[PDB]
Design a binder for this molecule. Structure first.
Ligand SMILES: CO[C@H](C(=O)NCc1ccc(CN)cc1OCC(N)=O)c1ccc(O)cc1
Ligand SMILES: [Ca+2]
Lengths: 57, 250
């Protein structure tokens, strides 16, 4: 996988590494899941999410 | 904002209102608890830098509902390359004197990594722009926060579709050429926010255009991806005496 195509499969940030390797990363306030692509909030008010709508669902 | 809708209270929680001596100046975007991104041009005519206030959690300017949080602006940082009265490099980074408290009504927008923004966010067609600016060209400003969904254009396409400042690599076009929908004067500095896989990111700053919602012209926004490393370096820096700071760019 490569970061320029489909964001390398990452939900947030993507780094290419030497030799068919890719690492996904997450913004502060999020942690990467064991799937290696998904980011889950670790704080009450993570950036870029709208509390009243997150609670709405 | 021309041709948008009221942003339901709490649905634009990163929006900032900038005031000078109590009067509306511009918008901005909260990106963490002490840092706000706005437009350089908002500060061209400031005389007393010590009367600048940022308000978070604002919605209706006619009433106080208790969700508003006001802070003094301790630093206004502008790139060396910005020239007052012109269009290029239209970005400012503002340090608040004290952090805001995050709540359901006050939440930062994510400042993306450059690669992610250039490779992925730049190709998301629609994004939201918001503010308390003019509801019509030559019209009154909004009392409730307004929001508008605008499509982004590649600059080559913007130039071909438009019919006078250059559109530089530090800008991008978004909106409509039929005169129905645009951001306006008083929205300057506010967010152009882009959704990707459940999270919103800062991709532009309301910057300029030919009037507001002028037929044959699109809105022009500061291309925030060009400034990620500049912003991140400044956020790691210690404050300096005196509010205005010009910082080298790149
Ligand atoms: C650098 O920005 C200023 C400025 O006034 N920006 C305000 C603004 C925000 C959004 C929109 C429409 N999206 C239009 C706007 O202004 C339209 C106008 N002034 O006719 C500028 C400077 C020099 C120049 O030649 C043109 C603009
Ligand atoms: Ca209010």
């Amino acid at each position: 996988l490569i970061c320029v195509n489909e964001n390398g499969g990452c939900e947030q940030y993507c780094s290419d590494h030497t030799g068919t390797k890719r690492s996904c990363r997450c913004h502060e306030g999020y942690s990467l899941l064991a799937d290696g692509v998904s980011c889950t909030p670790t704080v009450e008010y993570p950036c870029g999410k709208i509390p009243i709508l997150e609670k709405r669902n | 904002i021309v041709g948008g809708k009221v942003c339901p209270k709490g649905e634009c929680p990163w929006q900032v209102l900038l005031l000078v001596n109590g009067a509306q100046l511009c918008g901005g975007t909260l990106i963490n608890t002490i840092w706000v991104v706005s437009a350089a041009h908002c500060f061209d005519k400031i005389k007393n830098w010590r009367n600048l206030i940022a308000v978070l959690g604002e919605h209706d300017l006619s009433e106080h509902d208790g969700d508003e949080q006001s802070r003094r602006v301790a630093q206004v940082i502008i790139p060396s390359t910005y020239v007052p009265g012109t269009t290029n490099h239209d970005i400012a980074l503002l340090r608040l004197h004290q952090p805001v408290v995050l709540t359901d009504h006050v939440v930062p927008l994510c400042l993306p990594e450059r690669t992610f923004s250039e490779r992925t966010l730049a190709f998301v067609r629609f994004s939201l722009v918001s503010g308390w600016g003019q509801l019509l060209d030559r019209g009154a400003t909004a009392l409730e926060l307004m929001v508008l969904n605008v499509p982004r254009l590649m600059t080559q396409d913007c130039l071909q579709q438009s019919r006078s400042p250059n559109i530089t690599e530090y800008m991008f076009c978004a909106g409509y050429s039929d005169g129905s929908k645009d951001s306006c004067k008083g929205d300057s500095g506010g967010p152009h926010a882009t959704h990707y896989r459940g999270t919103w990111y800062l991709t532009g700053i309301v910057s300029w255009g030919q009037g507001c919602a002028t037929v044959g012209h699109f809105g022009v926004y500061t291309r925030v991806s060009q400034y990620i490393e500049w912003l991140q370096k400044l956020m790691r820096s210690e404050p300096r005496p005196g509010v205005l700071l010009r910082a080298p760019f790149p």
